[PDB]
Amino acid sequence: IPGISLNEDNSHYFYTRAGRRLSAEEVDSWVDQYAGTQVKELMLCPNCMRTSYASQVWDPIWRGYDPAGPDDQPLLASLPPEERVAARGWIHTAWQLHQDGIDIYARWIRRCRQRGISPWISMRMNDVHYVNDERCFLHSEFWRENPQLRRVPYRFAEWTDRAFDYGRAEVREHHLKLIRELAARYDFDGLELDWMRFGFHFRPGYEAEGAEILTAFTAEVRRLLDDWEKRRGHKIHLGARIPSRPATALGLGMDAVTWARRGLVDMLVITPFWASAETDMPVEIWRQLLEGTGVTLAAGLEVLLRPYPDSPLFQTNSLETVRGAAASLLDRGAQRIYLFNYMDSQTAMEDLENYPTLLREIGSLETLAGKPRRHVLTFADTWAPGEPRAIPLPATCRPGEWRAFRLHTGPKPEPGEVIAALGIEGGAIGPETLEVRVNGELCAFLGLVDLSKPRPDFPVYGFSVPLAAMRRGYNLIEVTARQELRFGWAEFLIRP
Amino acid sequence: IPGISLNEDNSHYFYTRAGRRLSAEEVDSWVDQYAGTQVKELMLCPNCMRTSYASQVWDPIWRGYDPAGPDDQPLLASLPPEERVAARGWIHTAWQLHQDGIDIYARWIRRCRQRGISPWISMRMNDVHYVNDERCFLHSEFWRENPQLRRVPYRFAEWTDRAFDYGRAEVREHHLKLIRELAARYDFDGLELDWMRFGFHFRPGYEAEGAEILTAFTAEVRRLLDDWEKRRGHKIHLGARIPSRPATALGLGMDAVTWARRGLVDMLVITPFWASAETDMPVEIWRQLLEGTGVTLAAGLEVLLRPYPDSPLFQTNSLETVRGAAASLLDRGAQRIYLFNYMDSQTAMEDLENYPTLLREIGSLETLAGKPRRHVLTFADTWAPGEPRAIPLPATCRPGEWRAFRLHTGPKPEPGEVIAALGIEGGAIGPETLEVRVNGELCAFLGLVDLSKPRPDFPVYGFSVPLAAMRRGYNLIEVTARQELRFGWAEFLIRP
């Protein structure tokens, strides 16, 4: 009964369906796969710097496009030949839909409500994909013509260095033009402000002024949706995607607690940016912070599952690891699981055959109960400029030294098997090299565990945990090594 | 004004006054030094595992003590000869005060009340000094006799490994016995549960059971003090010391938000343990978390000022660095500055001559306004077991890489000088080796800055900050190096 909010990105459908002349029937059919699942909202994303629909106030993705032209034309010249094919798949599908009189978002909204699903629009507030390429097809001419409105003029080490400065009146007006249009054109149940594309909206050091600025921006959004409530004749919700930890959120100018108390938002999605799902987010603290605000707290997952920032592994969540994350987050008080990058092809879980099952399971403690789950230790990819970073992995244990990992495994395990599993980097160990404890209780060596994807490319050793040791919420692995070892990977596998 | 809470420890007064037969008059005069200052409460600590007064339910410090005996007597046998002198200083001074019919805490309370100070009692809930020495004079026989009631049977790597487990009913009953005595013996304005001595009260992994357990204990303490409120004829306060971040506090089984909303406490002191004052604590988040509960939030300082956990420096805070910390925390919303280990001698500030100045200044932004101050980058000493740790220093910058440090400098500087100062560990920089920006603005090279204590034992390079670049709250130092460099120190010096 918590249920699922599922984000469809601005590019995905247009990439994957490229080369088909799409009917209105086919466009409608995309919604159907979500019908009869635990999905309660579809977060339809229509924009990056450019819109995928035929905007009057912004550049559509197909501005500058020669439909009959060669791949090597001005709009695509700046890409290597192979990437032209994929960009043009997005540009042409988006364009051809418009040429055929099909507004893909109007059709998805309408179809959502026939299928009992609540349709939302989710705007990317500050997308910066490929800003290293000034001539790239998907940048707005507004962005190309106005380098003075970027965040960081004194260097370029990161894409976010060329993000728009929301400190500027010009930049806010530019984003509010898109919103006024989205509210006029589309009869959505709610508008999501997606600050998490890419999280960085202010000059470094100006984030406190920025906080006051984004609260006032949010209030205008609410004030405008209140008008459209009267025009549409039903309630319109306003939500936002913000960082996973309160301090990082306030440090990037997102004072969501003020938004919630002033009645500006009624949904908050705490989430990472992209590098990895966070299996561990302080939901319970957010729940105290939002007490009495009537706001729906949504725990955001991302498709990637990686143990540390610098890992060369780029594997996605499985059904078992989303069951793990979802079990934990609901256990902590998440009033929704929110999927970002869990689409029906290309950007999707590694085990796509289990997507129907995933959408019928991860929305409830009841539907996860007694099912194989994996609770994997990751990290938070987004920190406010100069904020010290807390990254568990990797972790060296010198001989006779103790190392601890806390992993959130949510509901107490049902009768069955519990493994603490630990991967060791380098090139290894005896069954008495580690001493492994969970909540103080000795764990028996099991040996090499053969993991399903996602899995590291180094040995993973399994440790059998006494059932009764496991608690509700966090559980503590404690480990001492007789030899110096680097841990690259930690998890609990629970098999009832 | 917010004002000052000042903690006098269980040991200090008896250590420093050893060797003099003390008169009631001299005992009383100790309170007078705190009269007419911004000090509002004295937090008078009367215990570790043993009491400094003549307790009838716990061991006084002098249990085992032969007044007439040689230093080499069974109570002090386990210490090296020259530490027996200091130990016996405390024990003898404490013991002699009882024999002269002087109750130091009854007199202090009384004298506080005459000099318009609010007198508190602060109990150490789980002190473990020197628990490596099971024969040590300051451990309770109850501790010595009950190894099975400790937190961690499976290893001894830290003193907190031999702390009492409040998971056990006999451990809570043991501490409730002293509270029942302290409430009957002493007519205090409030009782402070000092959980931060040493902050670790539960078996590793049981900290969520712990949360329910400490809340139910705190409630019992509140119900007890409600009885004494009726006998004493006036309101009795309950406060507590807890970790500096909300996740770490809940992670150590201290759910102070529950305590506050259920009206169990009316004061909370966010604080480090010992290793360094924290110049940066999320006061503003605690203020949101505590909204409507009627609790006073106090920001706790410690006397040490150290850049990172493993630094070999052990210098203390100065008047300038305490003004720095105090300006910041008060700006962030602290309703009190709390000092721990800032006493009149031995354990105190490096510049003791400035103690009367400090006690009339750091309680208000008004009295701090227009005075030199130093905002030094430190670190949180205390993390929940297996909680990922965020430590800013030391920081390596590779050639052509960017490193940022956010430092909280509180109120916008008045007209005058601002220096960003950066200390470099290991073996030779030029005036262009570093590019230093504050809030994006270029800072001019100044050269080697000769710092007042506290100061690192490596070169400190100063950068002149355009006055107008400084903002209220955090200020961001960005630096890129042309050579690989490790930073061991970072501060803002503001000179009005």
Residue numbers in the entry:
A (entry chain B), B (entry chain A): 6 to 432, 434 to 502
The authors write:
To explore the 3-D structure and molecular determinants supporting the unique catalytic mechanism described by Chuzel et al. 26, the structure of EnvSia156 was determined on its own and in complex with N-acetylneuraminic acid (Neu5Ac), N-glycolylneuraminic acid (Neu5Gc), 2-keto-3-deoxy-d-glycero-d-galacto-nononic acid (KDN), and the inhibitor DANA. The absence of related 3-D structures dictated the need for a selenomethionine approach to phasing, so a selenomethionine derivative was crystallized and data collected at three different wavelengths (selenium peak, inflection, and high-energy remote). The resulting refined SeMet structure was subsequently used as the starting model for refinement of unliganded EnvSia156 and complexes with 20 mM Neu5Ac, Neu5Gc, DANA, KDN. Two copies of the protein were present in the asymmetric unit, each composed of two distinct domains. The two copies appear to be related by non-crystallographic symmetry resulting in a dimer, discussed below in light of the interface analysis and SEC-MALLS results. By coloring the structure according to homology, using the same color scheme as in the alignment, it is possible to identify a highly conserved pocket on the “N-terminal” face of the (β/α)8-barrel that sits at both ends of the continuous groove formed by the dimer. Considering its position and conservation, this site is a likely candidate to represent the EnvSia156 catalytic center. The identified conserved pocket indeed shows the presence of three 100% conserved arginines (Arg129, Arg 202, and Arg246), hinting at a sialoside-binding region, although one of them, Arg246, seems to be too buried to be able to interact with the carboxylate moiety of sialic acid. EnvSia156 also displays several highly conserved hydrophobic residues forming a pocket that could potentially accommodate the aglycone moiety of the sialoside substrates.
Here we describe the 3-D structure and catalytic center of the defining member, EnvSia156, of this sialidase family. We show, through ligand complexes with products and sialidase inhibitors, that the 3-D structure and active center are indeed an unusual arrangement, with family-conserved histidine and aspartate residues defining the catalytic mechanism that acts with inversion of anomeric configuration; facets not previously observed in the canon of literature for sialidases. The catalytic domain (residues 6–376) comprises a complete (β/α)8-barrel fold while the C-terminal domain (residues 377–502) consists of an eight-stranded β-sandwich. Here we show that GH156 sialidases define a distinct paradigm for sialidase action with His and Asp acting as Brønsted acid and base, respectively, in an inverting mechanism that is unique amongst all exo-sialidases described to date.
